[PDB]
Amino acid sequence: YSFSLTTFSPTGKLVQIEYALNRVSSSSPALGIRAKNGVIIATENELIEENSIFKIQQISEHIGIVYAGMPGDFRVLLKRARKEAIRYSLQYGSEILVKELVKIIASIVQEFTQTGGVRPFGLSLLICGVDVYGYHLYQIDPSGCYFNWMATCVGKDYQNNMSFLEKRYNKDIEIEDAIHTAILTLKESYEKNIEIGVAKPFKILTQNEIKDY
Amino acid sequence: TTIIGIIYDNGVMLACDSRTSTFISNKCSRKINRINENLYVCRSGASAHSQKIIEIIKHYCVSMKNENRKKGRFHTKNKYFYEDKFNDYNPLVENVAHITKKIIYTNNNFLSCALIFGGYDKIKKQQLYAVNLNGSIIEKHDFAVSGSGSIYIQSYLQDKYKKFMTKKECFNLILNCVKYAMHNDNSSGGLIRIVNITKSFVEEFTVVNTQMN
Amino acid sequence: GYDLSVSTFSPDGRLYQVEYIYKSINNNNTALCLECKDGIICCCINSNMDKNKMIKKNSYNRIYHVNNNIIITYSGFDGDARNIIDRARSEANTYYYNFHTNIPLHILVNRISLYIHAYTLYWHMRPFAASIIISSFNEKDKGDIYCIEPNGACYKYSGIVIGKNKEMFKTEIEKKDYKDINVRDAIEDIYKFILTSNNLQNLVNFSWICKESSYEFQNIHEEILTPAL
Amino acid sequence: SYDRAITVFSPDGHLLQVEHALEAVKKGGCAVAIKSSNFAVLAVEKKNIPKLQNPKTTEKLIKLDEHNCLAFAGLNADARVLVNKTRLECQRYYLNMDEPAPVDYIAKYVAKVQQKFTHRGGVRPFGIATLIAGFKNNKEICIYQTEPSGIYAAWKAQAIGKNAKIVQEFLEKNYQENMEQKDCIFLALKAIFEVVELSSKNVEVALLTEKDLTFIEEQEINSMV
Amino acid sequence: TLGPVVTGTSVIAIKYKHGIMIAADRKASYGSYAKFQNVERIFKINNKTVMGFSGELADAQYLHELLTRKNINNLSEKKRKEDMYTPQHYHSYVSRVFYVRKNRIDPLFNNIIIAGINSQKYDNNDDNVLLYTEYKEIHKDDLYIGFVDMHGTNFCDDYITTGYARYFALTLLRDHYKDNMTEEEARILINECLRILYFRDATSSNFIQIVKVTSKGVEYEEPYILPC
Amino acid sequence: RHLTIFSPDGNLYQIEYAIKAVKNTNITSVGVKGENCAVIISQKKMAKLLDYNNITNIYNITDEIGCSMVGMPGDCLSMVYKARSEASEFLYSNGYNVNAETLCRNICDKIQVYTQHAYMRLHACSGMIIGIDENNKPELFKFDPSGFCAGYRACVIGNKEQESISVLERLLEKRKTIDEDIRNTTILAIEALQTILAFDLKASEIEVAIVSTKNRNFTQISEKEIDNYLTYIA
Amino acid sequence: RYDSRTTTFSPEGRLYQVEYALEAINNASITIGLITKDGVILGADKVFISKLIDKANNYEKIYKIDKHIFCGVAGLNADANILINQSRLYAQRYLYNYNEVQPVSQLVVQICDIKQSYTQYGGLRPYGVSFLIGGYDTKDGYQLYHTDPSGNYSGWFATAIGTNNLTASSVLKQEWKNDMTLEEGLLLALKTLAKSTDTEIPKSEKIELAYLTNVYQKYLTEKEIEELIKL
Amino acid sequence: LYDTDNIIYSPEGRLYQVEYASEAIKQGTCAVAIKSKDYVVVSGLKKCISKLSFPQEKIFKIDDYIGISMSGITSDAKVLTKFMQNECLSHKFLYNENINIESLVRSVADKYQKNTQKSSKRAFGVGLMIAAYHNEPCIFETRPNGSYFEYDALSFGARSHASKTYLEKNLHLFEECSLEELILHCLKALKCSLLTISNTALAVVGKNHPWQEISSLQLEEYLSKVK
Amino acid sequence: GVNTFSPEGRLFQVEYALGAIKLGSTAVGICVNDGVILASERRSTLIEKDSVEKLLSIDDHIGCAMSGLMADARTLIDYARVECNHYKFIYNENINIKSCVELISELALDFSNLSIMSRPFGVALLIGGVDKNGPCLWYTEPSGTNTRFSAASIGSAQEGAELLLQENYKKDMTFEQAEILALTVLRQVMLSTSNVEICAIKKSDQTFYKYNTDDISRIIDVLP
């Protein structure tokens, strides 16, 4: 009973990838900005605890993750990314490079596009990180393609937010300026409903720090 | 080594020494392990085998206790009281002892441990079982002794035993038994740990004493 | 077109294959269990095979037992029920093998209900077409009776009926409380309910656990049933 | 479809997938085999875009072992994997018996493999038909033609591929027994040229002898009168 | 088991007028040390079948649990008393178990006796089998006493002694056993054999358990001390 | 909308249908955190001769951790056994007791593998889990058939979703010693269920389970306590 | 009924998934390859997603497989990367086996056999990517091989794949010669990439260009194309 | 739509594939089996497609005191026959006593049932008539849907209704009648189903009587006495 | 699916495979007391006639005539040859014809997976031989049913050959009478040596023997 659910259309399209792309397009917005001395990734009932619902997460000491799409798919992919980073660290004895982790996760995401009896992942990921080859921001789609970016946006209304950030973004920026631009873009797309993570080890900015910014 | 268990009126007292190994590697070792609040176990033989089967049996007892629960509403010493007043869901001593016997028998090609299970439950009242080297269980309705130092106190315990001993004289008997075994045996020494198990409460005594005559 | 598989919820949020299994079990032969003052009694009316006169007299016995002190009966397909009963016997044997003690009834009920439930998940397996009564009696605990539905549920009763005309048997037996009735005085009323809801002698199976069987599984003797008839 | 029946019987009684594999063979290029006293001649159509495609890379006439050669028609990747399997079995027989594999044995093996692929679960039939040529244990040369259906048969001369019926008729009305090498080569050329256009570059022809499978140079192919 | 540690000593079993009488002392020795002296060494398989062992105690307990599970498996698949398994069936099962274990070079370090009544005509005990709660004269051909060896060698006789009794009691039996023996004659003969074993065997004891497999089922007599 | 795969809209309708199945059972359960305790109150009814004491929705995964499942009963018991197996595996591998958060993470991963795979049916099961962590503070973690976990200060499973949030907000704002804290949390849970269901509740048809720092073990208060609290509220 | 039966013939003796994969590759970006007297030239087109990309280090078309073999991609990128990984694995496996660098044709045969295996065995979709694998070996020389989703490959002197490959092939037929220098080959590659997009002046911002010479692989930096554009 | 695969229950709650497998028995030839307190006799109609064809074997031995008749697909009958024979001989090798017919019929019914659950497999398209004398005579019926039944008398196959009516008429005679009378009764039932020395299969088993096909001559005077 | 029943209780794939065995050239098998004979028909001049062989020897003492899908037939005969030689190794004697036929029938229905192929074979076999019970001739079909026959025919012209076999066959026939009967039936349904191929297994030798051109011409000359 191992038969591929994702199948080529008569017009040469794997329409399940298009439908997962529509799903992540329907999800909450996410973005990332890369500065000369840093890289940030950010995202947008009164009873839910804010502590237990963090979309921004850490894979490694200098690698962070955020997503747009389904939460459970993100949790399993985060567990897999952490395991792959840990196995690289155990083998080569050093913290994993961003590009290798992105390639491994892209291959794993592409595998479910082809494996029989499964459907693709319904999310798009953003890796941020730092290594000896500088700062890195990488977007991974449901298709399994990894894109290297200077700055990017993912979720709802990502075309307008990309236009705004494109007119606002410069290569030579600071962490203060990058965080200000990220908050401006998020409030344009939209403090209590903002999450920011900066990468020196990867860090999560508390609500007090985000309020200060 | 010296591990002893003696039944007395409404209770059972287990007792052990602390010495481990010609060179004394350790001199404060808890040979009496708490499988459950109503059920303890004395260890003898190789320490690694004893620790591994005892923690496996703790895991099995947790599983049994979870499955024994019914649906709906019904109805320097240290002392503890049972959370289960009526023994609605605590596993029986015989069940734990027999699964331990099966564990030791199935892997008796290399396992070389001997155990004395002691406890209380509403069906059989207080209970003592002895699991031997090859994995043979015998219920000792009066007393069980094991370890290299137990051979020096067989006649002493056999002569001093009575059917319905009071708590005080049973405590004196078991304390003097372990003391004599420590006096005669090089492999046993250190402080004496005694565990008294009753219908409602468990007591855990620590004694420091030597032999003079 | 949402009912052609057990592994798919319809837009109403339900599994139609389970409801069709319920329909299959409901229009089948009748079974009942009842908890009396000092015993449990189990009865099974195999009236769907009344047209077949060639059958050997009193040989289609839907009542089975586990460990000589648990009754297990069913309504549904015979083979699937035998599969469930064999799994129950295997689980009891494994419990005694591990722990040297007879399995409690409710743990066996949970295990066999999980076994039934496991077939309702995958898309390549037929769910069980059988509803199982499993019951026991004790001197101190009195009678405990469990009905396991085909959907994996399991509910404790003080009396249960399944199969065809279950509403008639239920409303008839819900007239007298049997907790103050001896099990020997219940066979007459059960026969009366069978009349209300010639062939009565041979198309009926009976089983009992009380003092007179030393709290162990047994079939009621012909000499005990005949004066009650 | 890891283990599923792709090939099954139709209401009439046929296997539809085998017929579709036969259609795929009919799309394939034309190949021709002719026998002689102690040598064979295999000629197969070539289709190369001029000035861009490498002529040598496409290779429809293949050497299997010391004394067997193959010429297929159908799907090229299927042919490559089947030819690799055939070479592996040739060397396996020469390891397990210490004699070279005869042509009849290896033709039977290829036919058996195709039958197995038309019959096992989760497997597609081979969309290729082959013309194996080689030598027997008694030093006699022969040609075996094998279908996608798993049926094989020996032939004095045979044609496969697109417009195979016309070439078969031409071979029928022009074949003679024990003809010379020049006559055999010329007959193969004029037979395969009945359906493909008259040009030297649209064909590759080779002659199988006990020593080796020689390839005819393009100069010798040219000047065919 | 790689070899014996807590070992059980010999067992004696004979046929007599009303059924089977099987005797074993209640001692289990931990090497050369009487660690246990109240050990039940004869097991009740069912109402017309009992088992005894001589060898390692853990292996005997494992075999007893196996045969117990076989007994409840049989009882579950039972409709009439003739469906019950005789001592022949259990003897064949134990023989096959020992043979399969012998093929792997991993035996149960034991010598086993399976004994009982091999027919249902003498009583209706198994019409209503109860597990949790004058005699009739039975023909010798309807009784059964078996032997099974560590190598799987097995056989039957009117009287079987397993273990150290094979040299001591067996000789006496081969002089004194006779067909159609009363309960008293069988008892005094078995007591004499066990007295000789106690006087001339280190691992044996004088605390005996007798089990009778008779028309009214299996009967565990209260244990007693051999006088003198 | 048969397989658990994407529609042209992009949603997976099988999860929505499973959530509809959970809501169709008409079983209500309210979980409330406190200063040093957590309470779950559930309705205790099926999804004359029936034994009504046996009917329960709460369960004991461990002595410390407890839960309350709502949905299909077989799926509920299967999820209970999965939770117990997960906690047992954690205790075996790590030698210390799992907490509510990690157990909910693992259970939702187990739900997600069914969510992604076409050959697996989804469990029509929502569930609350409570316990005390190592810092001596309560936990209240809720999951649904979608495989999504979240911690709550208070939450409801049942029909009255995004309507009981209002009364829970009002009661928690109004409330905003260990014995007094436990008493107030239990009273708030009982009053919340009474206001949500909008009819007077008998003590013999509701089930209240409590975990706290005073008594680490998950336990259910007897019917006399519930009768006392119901008399106190009125 | 959920099985789509990807691995079955059609009534016309066709595999429909294979042709869908080919006409999907036809909608991908344009890729070009050719061989000169000194080295094998490959080049590609970049689908402009945004200027906010890190183009500095971005080669989403041409990839290195080994110091003697490299490839240019046309099709789905996620399907191409796994096959590139397999190609690298097989190259190092051959070097581990025979203590010798692999020939180009053997690696092409291995990856095309994997493609054929996906188009014949199981119930899985094919790989919808075509490769132009360039390389050097001592047995043959400079080689360029074109592949397909069907597992059918062919050797070429100069060819194109992707959108509007007919126009690129026409320009290559018109202009390509057997004896060409490296600079002439680069200029012809620029001309073909220009004519494919119907632009006389190519855009340096969206042209990837690389080559291999006897072994060393050069990936032209975004500044390096600008010297060739003016010439 | 509800009969495309064997795991789907109908809206009425029926397995259409298993019922089609049950329908497969009605195409087979008629077979009858009856018994007294001591003996069991099984009769069957051997199939002869043409006069050059030999008659098809209808009755098979399983053990010294167990034999069978089949109705349905012959390959399924061969599979089940080999299974029963191996089970009986395995019991006789492991143990020195005959297998219980109750356990053997339960095993065969479980084997029947195990094919009707997984989607890959299909239900057995054959009905089985097991005749034996374990310690008293007995006949068993086994159906595609995993169920089995005891029978005092039994018949099934093509045009089995007339023989069934004869059995319904004459059931009360079979207990006390002699073996000769029982053989004539079974042969008359098979005659009512519609008999020569070739197209009729006959077998007996009972007390101190292993499985035995009646000889050609003995069958000849038995058929003469039937006339 | 292949494992699915019709409402009439008949498997669809077996019913469809029965249509395949009709096609192919005609063959006849006749059994008499002295032995058994199988004659068969072969369907341009380029094909080597001896390469295609419609008669095969499963063993030294067994032969057959096959029809339907010929590649499946070759598979079945290879399996039967392996199993027959396995029997001869394990027991040191020849195998019964019924036992070999039952082995072939057991392999025929392996696709059902009742207790690995994936469809019926679509092959009809007419297997003749001589064993301790004398000569015999069995017939096997894709349905898995075996039938012992005194004489029978398979192939395209099955009905006409069967009618002539009913009309002309007698039990007490000499071997030459059976030979001329076989060639007469084949002459009616479709005669030089090129048309017909004959094999015989006799009680005297119990050995396969493929007829030569001289023998074929001889029995042609003996015919009217």
- Single-letter amino acid, residue C193: F
Nearest by Cα to D3 from I115, I117, H117: I117
Q: Which residue has the tokens 């390389």?
A: G135
- Pick from B109, B134, B151: CB nearest E58: B134
As beta bridge partners, residue G132 has G72, G146
Distance from CA of A154 to the nearest CA of F (A): 16
Rounded to whole angstroms, how far apart are CA atoms G121 and G109? 17
Which tokens hold the place of B15? 């007792």
Domain-embedded: residue D4: no
Rounded to whole angstroms, how far apart are CA atoms B191 and B46? 20
Task: For residue B97, count other CB atoms closer than 10 A to its CB.
Answer: 28
Which tokens hold the place of F169? 């907000």
Domains and CATH numbers, chain F: 1-234 (3.60.20.10)
B69 with F60: CB under 8 angstroms?
yes
The CATH superfamily holding the domain B1-211 is Aminohydrolase, N-terminal nucleophile (Ntn) domain (3.60.20.10)
User: How many DSSP H helices and E strands does chain F contain?
Assistant: 6, 10
- Region class of A134: left (phi > 0), else alpha (psi between -120 and 50), else beta: left
Across the interface, whether the CB atoms of I113 and H75 are under 8 A apart is answered no
Q: Which helix (H) or strand (E) holds I137?
A: strand I134-140
Cα separations (Å) of I4 from A1, A3, C118, H19?
Answer: 18, 21, 25, 12
Write b or e for each residue in D30-52: b if 16 or more Cβ atoms lie within 10 A of its Cβ, otherwise e: bbbbbbbeebbbbbbbbebeeeb
Breaks (C-N over 2.5 A) in chain F follow: 47, 176
Sequence-distant (6+) residues with CB within 8 A of G175 are G188, G191, G192
- Strand, helix or coil for residue G115: helix
Q: Which helix (H) or strand (E) holds C65?
A: strand C64-66
Nearest by Cα to A144 from G150, G45, G127: G127
Strand ranges inside chain H, DSSP E: 31-35, 39-45, 59-61, 66-72, 126-133, 137-142, 148-151, 153-156, 200-206, 209-213
Say if C101 is an interface residue toward chain E (CB within 8 Å). Answer: no
Structural domain including G145 reads: 1-231
- Pick from F54, F63, F217: CB nearest B72: F54
Tell me which residues of chain F have a C-beta less than 8 Å from any C-beta of chain B.
53-56, 60-63, 84, 88, 91-92, 95, 207, 217, 220, 222-223
Cα separations (Å) of A9 from A17, B4, D209, G161?
Answer: 11, 77, 51, 21
Which residues 138-197 of C are in CB contact (within 8 Å) with B?
156
- Pick from C101, C106, C110: CB nearest B94: C101
Rounded to whole angstroms, how far apart are CA atoms C149 and C134? 11
Q: Which helix (H) or strand (E) holds H185?
A: helix H179-193
Name the pairing type of β-strands B39-45 and B78-81. unpaired
Task: For residue C33, count other CB atoms closer than 10 A to its CB.
Answer: 26
Furthest-apart CA pair in chain D: how many Å? 56
Please tell me what DSSP assigns to residue I144.
Answer: -
C132 with C112: CB under 8 angstroms?
yes
Across the interface, whether the CB atoms of C117 and F14 are under 8 A apart is answered no
CATH of C1-229, one of 3.90.1300.10, 3.60.20.10, 3.40.50.620, 3.40.50.280: 3.60.20.10
As beta bridge partners, residue I40 has I27, I197
Nearest residue in chain I measured CA to CA from D159: I46
Q: Which residue has the tokens 């319920």?
A: C22
3-state secondary structure F84-144: HHHHHHHHHHHCCCCCHHHHHHHHHHHHHHHHHECCECCCCEEEEEEEECCCCCEEEEEEC
Q: Which residue has the tokens 């009882």?
A: E75
Q: How far apart are the first and last CA of chain G?
A: 60
I203 with I34: CB under 8 angstroms?
yes
Please tell me what DSSP assigns to residue H122.
Answer: -
Q: How many beta-carbon pairs under 8 angstroms link C with E?
A: 36
As beta bridge partners, residue B80 has B202
Give the technique used to solve this structure: cryo-EM
DSSP class per residue in B92-136: PHHHHHHHHHHHHHHTTTT--EEEEEEEEETTTEEEEEEE-SSS-
Rounded to whole angstroms, how far apart are CA atoms I187 and G47? 75
Cα separations (Å) of F223 from E77, F202, F228, H118?
Answer: 45, 10, 9, 48
CATH number for the domain that contains residue G114: 3.60.20.10
User: How many DSSP H helices and E strands does chain E contain?
Assistant: 4, 13
Sequence-distant (6+) residues with CB within 8 A of I5 are H17, H20, H21, H23, H24, H122, H123, H125, I11, I12
Mutate to test the interface with I, among H18, H25, H122, H126 (most CBs of I within 10 A): H122
Q: Which residue has the tokens 């087979």?
A: H28
F36 with F178: CB under 8 angstroms?
yes
Using CB atoms, which chains have 3+ pairs under 8 A with G? Answer: A, D, F
Rounded to whole angstroms, how far apart are CA atoms D62 and D48? 18
Chain G partners within 8 Å of F118 (Cβ): 2
Structural domain including I80 reads: 2-220
Distance from CA of A37 to the nearest CA of G (A): 16
Domain-embedded: residue D74: yes
Q: How far apart are the first and last CA of chain E?
A: 37
A128 with A39: CB under 8 angstroms?
yes
Sign (positive/negative) of CA torsion A35, A39, A44, A50?
negative
Rounded to whole angstroms, how far apart are CA atoms C196 and C169? 9
Using CB atoms, which chains have 3+ pairs under 8 A with H? Answer: C, E, I
E133 is annotated as an active-site residue: no
Sequence-distant (6+) residues with CB within 8 A of C53 are H168, H171
Using CB atoms, which chains have 3+ pairs under 8 A with A? Answer: D, F, G
- Pick from F14, F21, F54: CB nearest C14: F21
The CATH superfamily holding the domain A5-213 is Aminohydrolase, N-terminal nucleophile (Ntn) domain (3.60.20.10)
Mutate to test the interface with I, among H4, H75, H116, H128 (most CBs of I within 10 A): H75
Which tokens hold the place of H23? 């329908």
Cα radius of gyration (chain E) = 17
Say if F5 is an interface residue toward chain G (CB within 8 Å). Answer: no
CATH number for the domain that contains residue D44: 3.60.20.10
Sign (positive/negative) of CA torsion E196, E202, E203, E208?
positive
As beta bridge partners, residue G207 has G45
Chain I partners within 8 Å of D155 (Cβ): 46-48
Say if G103 is an interface residue toward chain D (CB within 8 Å). Answer: no
Rounded to whole angstroms, how far apart are CA atoms F9 and F7? 5
State residue A158 phi and psi, 5-degree precision.
-70, -25
Using CB atoms, which chains have 3+ pairs under 8 A with I? Answer: D, H
Across the interface, whether the CB atoms of G125 and A114 are under 8 A apart is answered yes
Distance from CA of F16 to the nearest CA of C (A): 8
Distance from the Cα of residue H41 to its chain's centroid: 11
- Quote the number of domains for chain H: 1
Chain B partners within 8 Å of C107 (Cβ): 67-68
- Pick from G23, G27, G54: CB nearest A150: G54
Q: Which residue has the tokens 């086993």?
A: E112
Do I and B make contact via 3 or more CB pairs under 8 A? The reply is no
Rounded to whole angstroms, how far apart are CA atoms F174 and F169? 8
Task: For residue E101, count other CB atoms closer than 10 A to its CB.
Answer: 17
Task: For residue B66, count other CB atoms closer than 10 A to its CB.
Answer: 21
Rounded to whole angstroms, how far apart are CA atoms G72 and G55? 17
- Quote the number of domains for chain D: 1
Across the interface, whether the CB atoms of D11 and I46 are under 8 A apart is answered no
- Strand, helix or coil for residue A158: helix
Rounded to whole angstroms, how far apart are CA atoms G142 and G182? 13
Domain-embedded: residue D6: no
Rounded to whole angstroms, how far apart are CA atoms A194 and A212? 13
Rounded to whole angstroms, how far apart are CA atoms D178 and D180? 7
Which residues 75-114 of E are in CB contact (within 8 Å) with C?
75-76, 79
Nearest by Cα to C135 from C37, C60, C185, C207: C207
Nearest residue in chain G measured CA to CA from D121: G122
3-state secondary structure chain D: CCCCCCCCECCCCCEHHHHHHHHHHHHCCCEEEEECCCCEEEEEECCCCCCCECCCCCCCEEECCCCEEEEEEECHHHHHHHHHHHHHHHHHHHHHHCCCCCHHHHHHHHHHHHHHHCCCCCECCCCEEEEEEEECCCCCEEEEEECCCCCEEEECEEEECCCHHHHHHHHHCCCCCCCCHHHHHHHHHHHHCCCCCCCCCCEEEEEECCCCEEECCHHHHCCCC
D57 with D214: CB under 8 angstroms?
no
Furthest-apart CA pair in chain G: how many Å? 60
Breaks (C-N over 2.5 A) in chain I follow: 43, 115, 190
D25 with D74: CB under 8 angstroms?
yes
E107 with E153: CB under 8 angstroms?
no
C60 with C199: CB under 8 angstroms?
no
- Strand, helix or coil for residue I145: coil
Sign (positive/negative) of CA torsion G67, G72, G73, G77?
positive
Rounded to whole angstroms, how far apart are CA atoms D124 and F186? 67
Rounded to whole angstroms, how far apart are CA atoms B180 and B196? 20
Nearest by Cα to G79 from G17, G138, G126: G126
CATH number for the domain that contains residue H124: 3.60.20.10
Rounded to whole angstroms, how far apart are CA atoms H136 and H128? 20
- Single-letter amino acid, residue D152: Y
Cα torsion for B102, B107, B112, B115, to the nearest 10°?
-20
Which tokens hold the place of B4? 């002893």
Q: Which helix (H) or strand (E) holds E54?
A: strand E49-55
Which tokens hold the place of B124? 């059989």
Mutate to test the interface with C, among H1, H3, H9 (most CBs of C within 10 A): H9
Nearest by Cα to C201 from C176, C226, C172: C226
Nearest residue in chain B measured CA to CA from C111: B67
> Using alpha carbons only, what angle is made at residue A188 by residues A183 and A191, rounded to the nearest 5 degrees?
40
Mutate to test the interface with H, among C16, C18, C56 (most CBs of H within 10 A): C56
3-state secondary structure I25-36: CCEEEEECCCEE
Q: Which residue has the tokens 């029909």?
A: F159
Rounded to whole angstroms, how far apart are CA atoms C182 and C130? 30
State residue G25 phi and psi, 5-degree precision.
-65, -35
> Using alpha carbons only, what angle is made at residue H181 by residues H178 and H185, rounded to the nearest 5 degrees?
135
- Pick from F3, F51, F118: CB nearest C156: F51
Sequence-distant (6+) residues with CB within 8 A of G44 are G29, G30, G31, G32, G61, G62, G72, G73, G207, G208, G209
Mutate to test the interface with C, among F1, F81, F121 (most CBs of C within 10 A): F121
Say if C67 is an interface residue toward chain E (CB within 8 Å). Answer: yes
Nearest by Cα to G72 from G157, G127, G144, G168: G144
Chain F partners within 8 Å of B35 (Cβ): none
Say if A116 is an interface residue toward chain D (CB within 8 Å). Answer: yes
- Strand, helix or coil for residue G161: strand
Of the residues B1, B2, B20, B100, only one is catalytic, namely B1
CATH number for the domain that contains residue I129: 3.60.20.10
